[PDB]
Amino acid sequence: MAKDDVIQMQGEVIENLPNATFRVKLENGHVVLGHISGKMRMHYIRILPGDKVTVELTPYDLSRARIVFRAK
């Protein structure tokens, strides 16, 4: 199936920063920085270092992605 250049990766949080920003490391070890938003995200969720979450990398670069809900 064809589509944009968006790909969901499975990584774990490594650090936590303000501005609704968070860092997660993929399988290669590289950490990506992004922001978390949405419905379940506005429910005052609990985030901590070591949690499995999904992140969608953008074509802009490999140093900025979108924070997605936890890894199913």
CATH number, domain with residue 31: 2.40.50.140
Give how far Cα 29 sits from Cα of 12, 24, 45, 46, Å: 10, 9, 25, 23
- Using the Cα atoms of residue 60, residue 37, residue 54 and residue 1 in order, give the sign of their dihedral: negative
| Boundaries of domain holding 22 | 1-72
Q: Which of 45, 55, 49 is CA-nearest to residue 16?
A: 49
Q: Which of 18, 19, 14, 1 is CA-nearest to residue 55?
A: 14
Alpha-carbon distance of 17 to 35, in angstroms, equals 10
Domains in the chain: how many in total? 1
| Method for structure elucidation | NMR
